[PDB]
């Protein structure tokens, strides 16, 4: 897991290494700060959409803990020796991001289906296919990055299979969105279309980070990847769940929930 990542191949200057450390530690604070926000606003959401904000809190801590885990792992693996930080232990890898995405993604998808006003049969059915599509995407992608050092061709093939799931997954998402936005209240039929494009953008940054070993195999590619992961995390989880929350509140107010109508 550790020796399989391009991180293990390079020494890092002080500036590259502190900069990565600060991207992770910052990612933690952003998520734990948003957790408090999502927490305080749960009271202004009608019982119908209130699980959607709870799922945001679950994401913020799930990501926060894996990011904080990367941060520490980052500093335990390297030591400043002779003017550069040099690998000292086999503790750091991006594999724990992948096993994290197995959890956060179903939560990010569920809160979408919730604000879309699905329920019962369709909610359980659409939920099942998306998580299996997402899990297929994640698993094929995890196996592929195990070769980002040894067999790039393999990374390309698994990346290809992973993208097949990704494409099927977004097609289902978009289909349910455009077929059910006429149901949403307070004018959120316009917001949800924006959230979808936000999904398409932020999520597409991930495969771009996945391919960094293929076009930038050096220490500055290790920095660019984390920088890309940071931008994707902040957009796919924080900004994403902020608009999920806005949508939830808006419809709560439009549906006659008083705490929502007074919050707004």
Ligand X SMILES: CCCCCCCC/C=C\CCCCCCCC(=O)OC[C@H](O)CO
Residue 172 binds which of ligand OLA, ligand RET, ligand X, none (CB < 5-8 A, kind-dependent): ligand X
> Is 126 near ligand X (CB under 6 A)?
yes
- CB count in 10 Å sphere of residue 3: 12
> Is 125 near ligand X (CB under 6 A)?
yes
Among 159, 186, 213, 241, binds ligand RET (CB under 6 A): 159
Nearer to ligand RET, 44 or 166 (CB): 166
Q: Which residues of 33-71 are buried (b: 16+ CB within 10 A; e: fewer)?
A: ebbebbeebbebbbebbbbbbebbbbbbebbbebbbbbb
> Is 70 near Cl ion (CB under 5 A)?
no
Tokens of 72: 């520490």
> Is 56 near Cl ion (CB under 5 A)?
no
Provide φ and ψ at 84, rounded to 5°. -160, 155
> Is 63 near Cl ion (CB under 5 A)?
yes
Residue 124 binds which of ligand OLA, Cl ion, ligand X, none (CB < 5-8 A, kind-dependent): ligand OLA
Q: After which residues is the chain broken (C to N over 2.5 A)?
A: none
> What is the distance between the alpha carbons of residues 146 and 135, in angstroms, rounded to a whole number?
17
> What is the distance between the alpha carbons of residues 264 and 216, in angstroms, rounded to a whole number?
47
> Is 207 near ligand X (CB under 6 A)?
no
Nearer to ligand X, 208 or 263 (CB): 208
CB 111 within 8 A of CB 242: no
Q: Which parts of this chain interact with ligand OLA (CB under 6 A)?
A: 21, 25, 28-29, 32-33, 36, 51, 68, 71-72, 74-75, 110, 123-124, 127-128, 131-132, 136, 140, 154, 157, 161
Select from 19-27, 33-41, 100-108, 159-167 the region that touches ligand X (CB under 6 A). 159-167
CB 5 within 8 A of CB 148: yes
- CB count in 10 Å sphere of residue 196: 17
> Is 105 near ligand RET (CB under 6 A)?
yes
Residue 156 binds which of ligand X, ligand OLA, Cl ion, none (CB < 5-8 A, kind-dependent): none
> What is the distance between the alpha carbons of residues 131 and 108, in angstroms, rounded to a whole number?
10
Which chain residues interact with ligand X by CB under 6 A? 125-126, 129, 160, 163-164, 167-168, 170-172, 174-175, 178
Which chain residues interact with Cl ion by CB under 5 A? 63, 100, 104
């Amino acid at each position: 897991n550790s020796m399989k990542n391009i991180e293990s191949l390079f020494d890092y200057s002080a500036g590259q290494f502190e900069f990565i450390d600060h991207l992770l530690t910052m990612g933690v604070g952003v998520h734990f700060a948003a957790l408090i926000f999502f927490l305080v606003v749960s009271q202004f959401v009608a019982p119908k959409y209130r699980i959607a904000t709870a799922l945001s809190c679950i994401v913020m801590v799930s990501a926060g803990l894996i990011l904080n885990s990367q941060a520490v792992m980052w500093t335990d693996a390297y030591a400043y020796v002779d003017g550069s930080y040099q690998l000292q232990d086999l503790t750091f890898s991006n594999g724990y991001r992948y096993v994290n995405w197995m959890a956060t993604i179903p939560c990010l998808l569920l809160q979408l289906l919730i604000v879309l006003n699905l329920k019962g049969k369709e909610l359980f059915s659409t939920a099942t296919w998306l998580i299996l599509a997402a899990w297929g995407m994640i698993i094929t992608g995890y196996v592929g990055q195990l070769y980002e050092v040894d067999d790039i061709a393999q990374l390309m093939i698994w990346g290809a299979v992973s993208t097949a799931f990704f494409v099927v997954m977004n097609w289902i998402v978009g289909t349910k969105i455009f077929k059910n936005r006429a149901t949403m209240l307070g004018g959120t039929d316009s917001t949800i279309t924006k959230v979808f494009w936000l999904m398409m953008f932020a999520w597409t940054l991930y495969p771009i980070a996945y391919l960094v070993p293929a076009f930038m195999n050096n220490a500055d590619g290790v920095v660019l990847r984390q920088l890309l992961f940071t931008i994707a995390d902040i957009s796919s989880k924080v900004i994403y769940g902020l608009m999920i929350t806005y949508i939830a509140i808006q419809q709560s107010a439009a549906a006659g929930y008083v705490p929502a109508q007074q919050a707004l």
